[PDB]
Design an enzyme around this catalytic site. Structure first.
Site, PDB file in Angstrom:
ATOM      1  N   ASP B 103       0.809  -1.212   0.000  1.00 17.82           N
ATOM      2  CA  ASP B 103       0.000   0.000   0.000  1.00 17.82           C
ATOM      3  C   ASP B 103       0.848   1.271   0.000  1.00 17.82           C
ATOM      4  O   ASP B 103       0.445   2.299  -0.537  1.00 17.82           O
ATOM      5  CB  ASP B 103      -0.943  -0.009   1.199  1.00 17.82           C
TER       6      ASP B 103
HETATM    7  N1  LIG Z   1       2.031   2.865  10.101  1.00 21.07           N
HETATM    8  C1  LIG Z   1       0.967   2.694  10.862  1.00 21.07           C
HETATM    9  O1  LIG Z   1       0.949   2.934  12.062  1.00 21.07           O
HETATM   10  C2  LIG Z   1      -0.297   2.159  10.168  1.00 21.07           C
HETATM   11  C3  LIG Z   1      -1.483   1.936  10.936  1.00 21.07           C
HETATM   12  C4  LIG Z   1      -2.704   1.416  10.386  1.00 21.07           C
HETATM   13  C5  LIG Z   1      -2.699   1.138   9.005  1.00 21.07           C
HETATM   14  N2  LIG Z   1      -1.524   1.377   8.231  1.00 21.07           N
HETATM   15  C6  LIG Z   1      -1.613   1.079   6.813  1.00 21.07           C
HETATM   16  O2  LIG Z   1      -0.828  -0.105   6.507  1.00 21.07           O
HETATM   17  C7  LIG Z   1      -0.025   0.074   5.339  1.00 21.07           C
HETATM   18  C8  LIG Z   1       1.447  -0.122   5.662  1.00 21.07           C
HETATM   19  O3  LIG Z   1       2.239  -0.076   4.467  1.00 21.07           O
HETATM   20  P1  LIG Z   1       2.822  -1.440   3.849  1.00 21.07           P
HETATM   21  O4  LIG Z   1       3.654  -1.183   2.686  1.00 21.07           O
HETATM   22  O5  LIG Z   1       3.518  -2.250   4.891  1.00 21.07           O
HETATM   23  O6  LIG Z   1       1.440  -2.117   3.380  1.00 21.07           O
HETATM   24  P2  LIG Z   1       0.533  -3.475   3.690  1.00 21.07           P
HETATM   25  O7  LIG Z   1       0.752  -3.207   5.128  1.00 21.07           O
HETATM   26  O8  LIG Z   1      -0.476  -2.934   2.754  1.00 21.07           O
HETATM   27  O9  LIG Z   1       1.634  -4.358   2.967  1.00 21.07           O
HETATM   28  C9  LIG Z   1       1.830  -5.647   3.541  1.00 21.07           C
HETATM   29  C10 LIG Z   1       2.836  -6.480   2.767  1.00 21.07           C
HETATM   30  O10 LIG Z   1       3.390  -7.526   3.553  1.00 21.07           O
HETATM   31  C11 LIG Z   1       3.103  -8.832   3.035  1.00 21.07           C
HETATM   32  N3  LIG Z   1       3.356  -9.900   3.991  1.00 21.07           N
HETATM   33  C12 LIG Z   1       2.597 -10.412   5.011  1.00 21.07           C
HETATM   34  N4  LIG Z   1       3.318 -11.391   5.619  1.00 21.07           N
HETATM   35  C13 LIG Z   1       4.490 -11.450   4.978  1.00 21.07           C
HETATM   36  C14 LIG Z   1       5.616 -12.238   5.180  1.00 21.07           C
HETATM   37  N5  LIG Z   1       5.654 -13.131   6.152  1.00 21.07           N
HETATM   38  N6  LIG Z   1       6.731 -12.101   4.367  1.00 21.07           N
HETATM   39  C15 LIG Z   1       6.744 -11.216   3.353  1.00 21.07           C
HETATM   40  N7  LIG Z   1       5.661 -10.452   3.160  1.00 21.07           N
HETATM   41  C16 LIG Z   1       4.535 -10.537   3.951  1.00 21.07           C
HETATM   42  C17 LIG Z   1       1.734  -8.670   2.374  1.00 21.07           C
HETATM   43  O11 LIG Z   1       1.344  -9.631   1.347  1.00 21.07           O
HETATM   44  P3  LIG Z   1       1.357 -11.287   1.441  1.00 21.07           P
HETATM   45  O12 LIG Z   1       0.329 -11.622   2.514  1.00 21.07           O
HETATM   46  O13 LIG Z   1       0.805 -11.724   0.078  1.00 21.07           O
HETATM   47  O14 LIG Z   1       2.742 -11.702   1.757  1.00 21.07           O
HETATM   48  C18 LIG Z   1       2.051  -7.307   1.734  1.00 21.07           C
HETATM   49  O15 LIG Z   1       2.923  -7.373   0.591  1.00 21.07           O
HETATM   50  C19 LIG Z   1      -0.472   1.439   4.767  1.00 21.07           C
HETATM   51  O16 LIG Z   1      -1.485   1.118   3.775  1.00 21.07           O
HETATM   52  C20 LIG Z   1      -1.196   2.195   5.908  1.00 21.07           C
HETATM   53  O17 LIG Z   1      -2.341   2.900   5.411  1.00 21.07           O
HETATM   54  C21 LIG Z   1      -0.308   1.876   8.791  1.00 21.07           C
END
Ligand SMILES: NC(=O)c1ccc[n+]([C@@H]2O[C@H](COP(=O)([O-])OP(=O)(O)OC[C@H]3O[C@@H](n4cnc5c(N)ncnc54)[C@H](OP(=O)(O)O)[C@@H]3O)[C@@H](O)[C@H]2O)c1
Ligand SMILES: NC(=O)c1ccc[n+]([C@@H]2O[C@H](COP(=O)([O-])OP(=O)(O)OC[C@H]3O[C@@H](n4cnc5c(N)ncnc54)[C@H](O)[C@@H]3O)[C@@H](O)[C@H]2O)c1
Lengths: 366, 174, 362
Positions: B103
């Site tokens: 994201d």
């Molecule tokens: N920073 C904060 O405090 C906060 C708070 C609430 C919401 N958010 C939101 O969360 C997002 C955070 O950015 P982000 O880039 O990290 O986005 P995501 O949180 O949208 O990305 C998650 C990535 O990790 C993967 N993943 C899960 N388990 C994994 C593993 N064991 N090994 C490798 N990959 C794995 C997921 O797909 P797979 O399952 O297919 O591997 C995916 O590619 C933003 O959209 C933001 O709006 C952030």
């Protein structure tokens, strides 16, 4: 136009809705920043650095708010019914941005309405990606989660990190965090880096991954393996009995804090332990905690500081000031010195409580 | 419709690059790959490659989430940069090793004003020579929306776990 | 041959010279261990836990040393002149071990002498290596370093670690540690753990590498186990290359000390007055004059926008860990002299562990 920041009059509130960096951005947006003198003392922002940024200094609160078209502060202004009439000091027709606590303080909302003030209650900010830079709920809770560990370390008579020495070895402190929101996440992070053996528990199952993403160990009655499963509290108790510092962060908007640690439980704990209740200002997750003090019964120091974020006012404040600025910037414009809030903007419709004499926000029985 | 890749591949892509900047995200943390990443980096800049980290403000699931993990693994502070003081470096970068991100790089933020992730600033991984995504599958991220950057010219899909997949990529790179 | 552990009375002391692990081991040597009830409260050591260990509990402090052949205590006993003559309980003719603070308390050394009591001042221990496991200085000062970063963090209005957030970046607290000795090194370690950017300086040369392998960056200025003065010409050269970092510092931990002398001045007013407002100084040498004049024992002092902390008996602020450790230091000193089943302490005498430790042995 003119924007002003007053000192925080509520007791034990060292934060301030401004910062050098933000002054300079505001100025840059065509504003005339004015801030009551010594308003950032508790946050380590001197009038010197505050002026050196582009801001003028006012002698009193009354004088700063005097003729400001926009006013910022952290906690809701005090009403006449409370001893001090700050809302009275705000100019009629002005704009107010702060943590109003509107849905829980009908009075202040009304006080403001009299004076035809337009108030945007920051805490009602919508939860939508483009607004995370506007969320004061998480910026502050985050620092409070950090603080719980620090306060917890402080009151605990042992070091957090395990230490092998010539004279022998001392085991690591064991921490248990209840509630894995932002505060609890930063808590787990801070406790672990210090070296503690951290455990965490939270009713929202999706929590296990988050917790593990910080090095934590989610507590689960996995005899099963993801009738009344209510004996989940028995897996918890098993861990709470070996716990040294227990940090409780469970909080519900508009309702009393949910009991997470029964006294019946604090008894089963070991002497010397300490419980940090960040929910104290709302009844607490632990019924023994008392707003503003460290109570001791059954040998456990149940800590209950209020306004924890303020305990980190030096960092809390600039973050808070950035939240305010990010919320405001998209509305300032040419007219080259006027601000307009497009009602189509969800950020403005869900944050606004009253506008030019009329409580507008839905939830507020009007 | 999506190009896939393997450890050896990525190993090759990055090994023959000048500038490579990492992009840790919630994935990188679910798998606790701080160290594996810290390695692939120091033995990448061992060849001589140029390494940096692009920490996006809401990367992970809490403020400072990538920061604490990178710090546990000892990645030098002066290699870690905030979204703003670095978004301009993707243009002149060979590879954007997106380990765990999603994201955070999704261009629907700048585009499709219909999306949930609309308006949120993002790192310019698309403006980079070649992208190197990592993730167990094709699921979405927090937002629950497909990242179109997923399938396009220079986007790889090194499916698998971040710690293992980064551990192998280290291996085949000696 | 009984050995007992009273309950520490001096104000603020929460440490106890005993623990379960050590009681079980003392029983093994042949002593019957007697501990004053409640003696372990501060160090969270329970009576029941000392019981199950093999020790015996005494109703009163009076009843504790009442027959004890050897007495273990953390701090030096209180003379009648201080409030309640404790030296008056110690069964005359016994051996007492503890942080007697010999060299600067002759009045207690003479009181134990009229009681014909044999005492060993544990702080006089030689700097020889086969004594690390007996050094109460090191074991305690190690927890002091940890506690400094903590107390420092508690008084600081900012957070230690850097955090990039949706609301901007909270920068890493910059810490400076004056005196990279045992306490300094622990402080450096603990500071780094929390995510600070640590800076360190010391007059000793070896120091510089130890700081680099913990993650710190050494501020290069310009002896049988420590250092001596450097003179006004050095102190000046120091404050010169120090001040440069001192202005950007958030927390500054001073720990420098000098055998039988007053603590070396490291941060003068002219200097505190040049620090960022909100900064904190933790003075671990305050009970010995501090490394910063402004500090005053047992109190926090705010002046010039700086908070100069100076608690006393810092090791007691970590009582629960300090106790087990102090206790074991005692056990390691004593054990080499308990003779192969004869229930008697034959303090080797020719052993430098006993020579430069015993103050009075009537
Ligand atoms: N920073 C904060 O405090 C906060 C708070 C609430 C919401 N958010 C939101 O969360 C997002 C955070 O950015 P982000 O880039 O990290 O986005 P995501 O949180 O949208 O990305 C998650 C990535 O990790 C993967 N993943 C899960 N388990 C994994 C593993 N064991 N090994 C490798 N990959 C794995 C997921 O797909 P797979 O399952 O297919 O591997 C995916 O590619 C933003 O959209 C933001 O709006 C952030
Ligand atoms: N028997 C043993 O095994 C044993 C016992 C004690 C100490 N030691 C050794 O001695 C060394 C230090 O012990 P310590 O920590 O107890 O000493 P300490 O607490 O007395 O010294 C604190 C620090 O003050 C520094 N210092 C003094 N004046 C200074 C000045 N003007 N500028 C900068 N620094 C100044 C010292 O060099 C030292 O590093 C360590 O290397 C340690 O290992 C060994």
């Amino acid at each position: 136009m003119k924007i002003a920041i007053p000192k925080e009059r509520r007791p034990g509130e060292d934060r301030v809705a401004i910062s050098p960096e933000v002054v300079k951005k505001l100025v840059g947006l065509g504003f005339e920043v004015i801030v009551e003198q010594g308003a950032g003392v508790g946050a380590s922002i001197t009038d010197d650095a505050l002026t050196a940024a582009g801001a003028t200094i006012a002698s009193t609160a009354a004088q700063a708010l005097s003729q400001a078209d926009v006013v910022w502060k952290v906690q809701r202004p005090m009403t006449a019914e409370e001893g001090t009439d700050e809302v009275a000091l705000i100019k009629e027709g002005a704009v107010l941005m702060c943590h109003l606590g509107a849905l829980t303080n009908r009075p202040v909302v009304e006080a403001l309405t009299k004076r035809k003030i337009t108030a945007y209650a920051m805490e009602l900010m919508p939860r939508i990606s483009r607004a995370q830079s506007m969320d004061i709920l998480s910026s502050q809770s985050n620092l409070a989660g950090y603080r719980a560990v620090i306060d917890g370390a402080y009151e605990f008579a042992r070091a957090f990190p395990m230490m092998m020495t010539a004279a022998g070895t001392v085991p690591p402190a064991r921490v248990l965090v209840f509630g894995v929101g932002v505060a609890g996440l930063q808590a787990i992070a801070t406790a672990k880096r210090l070296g503690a053996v951290v455990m965490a528990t939270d009713v929202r199952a999706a929590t296990k991954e988050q917790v593990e993403s910080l090095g934590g160990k989610f507590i689960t009655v996995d005899d099963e393996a993801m009738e009344f499963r209510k004996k989940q509290a028995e897996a918890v108790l098993k861990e709470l009995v070996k716990t040294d510092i227990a940090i409780t962060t469970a909080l519900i908007p508009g309702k009393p804090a949910p009991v997470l640690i029964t006294e019946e439980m604090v008894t089963k704990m070991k002497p010397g332990s300490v419980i940090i209740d960040l929910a104290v200002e709302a009844g607490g997750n632990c019924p023994l905690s008392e707003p503003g003090k460290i109570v001791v019964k059954h040998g456990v120091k149940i800590v209950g500081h209020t306004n924890v974020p303020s305990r980190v006012a030096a960092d809390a404040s600039p973050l808070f000031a950035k939240n305010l600025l990010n919320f405001l910037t998209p509305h300032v414009d040419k007219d080259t010195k006027t601000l307009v809030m497009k009602l189509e903007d969800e950020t403005v419709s869900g944050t606004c409580v009253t506008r030019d004499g009329a409580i507008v926000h839905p939830a507020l029985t009007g | 419709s999506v190009k896939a890749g393997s450890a050896e591949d990525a190993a090759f892509i990055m090994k023959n690059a000048s500038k490579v900047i990492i992009v840790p995200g919630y994935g990188m943390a679910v798998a606790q790959a701080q160290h594996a990443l810290r390695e692939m980096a120091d033995v990448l800049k061992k060849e001589g490659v140029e390494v940096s980290y692009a920490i996006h403000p809401v990367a992970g699931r809490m403020p400072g989430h990538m920061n604490v993990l990178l710090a546990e693994a000892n990645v030098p502070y002066d290699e870690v940069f905030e979204l703003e003081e670095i978004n301009s470096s993707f243009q002149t970068a060979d590879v954007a090793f997106v380990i765990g991100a999603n994201d955070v790089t999704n261009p629907a933020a700048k585009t499709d004003p219909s999306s949930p992730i609309y308006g949120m600033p993002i790192l310019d991984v698309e403006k980079a020579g070649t992208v190197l995504f990592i993730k167990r599958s094709m699921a979405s991220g927090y937002a629950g929306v497909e990242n179109e950057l997923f399938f396009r010219n220079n986007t790889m899909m090194l499916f698998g776990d971040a710690k293992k997949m980064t551990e192998q990529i280290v291996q085949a790179m000696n």
